[PDB]
Design a protein around this ligand. Structure first.
Ligand SMILES: *[C@@H]1O[C@H](CO)[C@@H](O[C@@H]2O[C@H](CO)[C@@H](O[C@@H]3O[C@H](CO)[C@@H](O)[C@H](O)[C@@H]3O)[C@H](O)[C@H]2NC(C)=O)[C@H](O)[C@H]1NC(C)=O
Ligand SMILES: *[C@@H]1O[C@H](CO)[C@@H](O[C@@H]2O[C@H](CO)[C@@H](O)[C@H](O)[C@H]2NC(C)=O)[C@H](O)[C@H]1NC(C)=O
Length: 309
């Protein structure tokens, strides 16, 4: 809506009084100068058709640890620690997917280092949404089993690393000066002399509640989730997030990768779609069990299909 910057010095102070110190907020962080309208732009979740995940007896009964990190469970996969950046778009719905989809061709797909093309997804799946104006994860994963996608090497993500800092700590260009539209849907690699390879999943499903999450994450690896972004989330720096003050900004899609506790506080470790500069090095930690901002209300995942025989 407005061009009014979202972060106040007073706003933040308030927030830091109400969180009890549980999680640090920052007013002069990487996000102070950010526009109200620029913020809602990053929240790409708009609008289950997916079968709910049924756990086998064997899975259902397994004693899940108090702490679990996906990058540790599968040390041999480089796609897990890698943080994504959706630039200046509502790509989160798509980015968050390809991310988990890349991660899952490992944990399950038998291919180690394959970055699924979030751009390809973002531009060709039409029932998913309006592209860079909002999307629906459930369908993202459906199109992965339905149509299938291409590697990042074939069809790279078209928007550059964008920073919300006048002077970036990694020297990216500022976000303020970007306004991206849904790219064109292409059917050959951006370099036509690169053969087009198609990666589909052979099934997709949906997750709900605290336990489905851990249990599915444990066996199959990171997947896609969404939650409500309030103004306080923007000023997130560290510690375990939970909503205390702020206007609604929209549903935002992220990638789940772990869980633990911090001083008696159960949390989810989540990989974000905004830089390595934001939060805990692109990461952030929300509150497990509350279902904070609805983060446990709906998940999305699938099993990738190993290429060839
Ligand atoms: C599908 O392939 C086409 C191949 O060009 C891609 O469209 C092009 O995307 C590039 C990179 O985002 C755009 O570059 C921009 O060009 C303008 C000049 O018009 C400039 O202002 C920017 O600084 C930037 O260099 C380009 O405009 C755009 N061209 C067309 C015809 O759409 C598209 O991104 C590919 N889509 C996917 C999903 O891979
Ligand atoms: C937000 O904007 C402020 C000021 O509008 C920026 O602070 C200035 O940074 C410039 C370099 O870009 C310095 O020369 C000045 O020392 C600062 N001036 C003032 C008045 O603060 C700041 O870079 C921006 N903040 C972030 C986090 O990007």
């Amino acid at each position: 809506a407005e061009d009014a910057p979202v972060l106040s010095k007073a706003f933040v102070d308030r927030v830091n009084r109400l969180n009890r110190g549980i999680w640090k907020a920052k007013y002069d962080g990487v996000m102070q100068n950010i526009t109200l309208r620029e913020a809602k732009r990053l929240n790409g979740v708009i609008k289950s058709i997916l079968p709910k995940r049924r756990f086998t007896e064997e899975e259902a009964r397994a004693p899940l640890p108090s702490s679990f990190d996906s990058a540790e469970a599968w040390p041999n996969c480089p796609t897990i620690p890698q943080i994504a950046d959706q630039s200046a778009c509502g790509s989160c719905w798509a980015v968050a997917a390809a991310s988990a989809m890349s991660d899952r061709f490992c944990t399950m797909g038998g291919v180690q280092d394959v970055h699924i093309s979030a751009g390809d997804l973002l531009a060709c799946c039409s029932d998913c949404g309006d592209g860079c104006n909002g999307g629906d994860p459930d369908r993202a994963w459906a199109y992965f089993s339905s149509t299938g996608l291409v590697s990042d090497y074939c069809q790279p993500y078209p928007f550059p690393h964008c920073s919300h800092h006048s002077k970036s700590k990694n020297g990216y260009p500022p976000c303020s000066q970007f306004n991206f539209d849904t790219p064109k849907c292409n059917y050959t690699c951006d370099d036509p002399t690169i053969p087009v390879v198609n990666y589909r999943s052979w099934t997709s499903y949906a997750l709900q509640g605290e336990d489905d999450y851990m249990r599915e994450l444990f066996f199959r690896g990171p997947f896609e989730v969404a939650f409500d972004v309030y103004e306080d989330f923007i000023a997130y720096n560290s510690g375990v997030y939970h909503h205390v003050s702020g206007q609604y900004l929209g549903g935002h899609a992220v990638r789940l990768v772990g869980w633990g506790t911090s001083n008696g506080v159960p949390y989810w470790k989540i990989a974000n779609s905004w830089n390595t500069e934001w939060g805990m090095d692109g990461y952030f930690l929300i509150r497990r069990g509350s279902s904070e901002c609805g983060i446990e209300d709906g998940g999305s995942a699938g099993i990738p299909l190993a290429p060839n025989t």
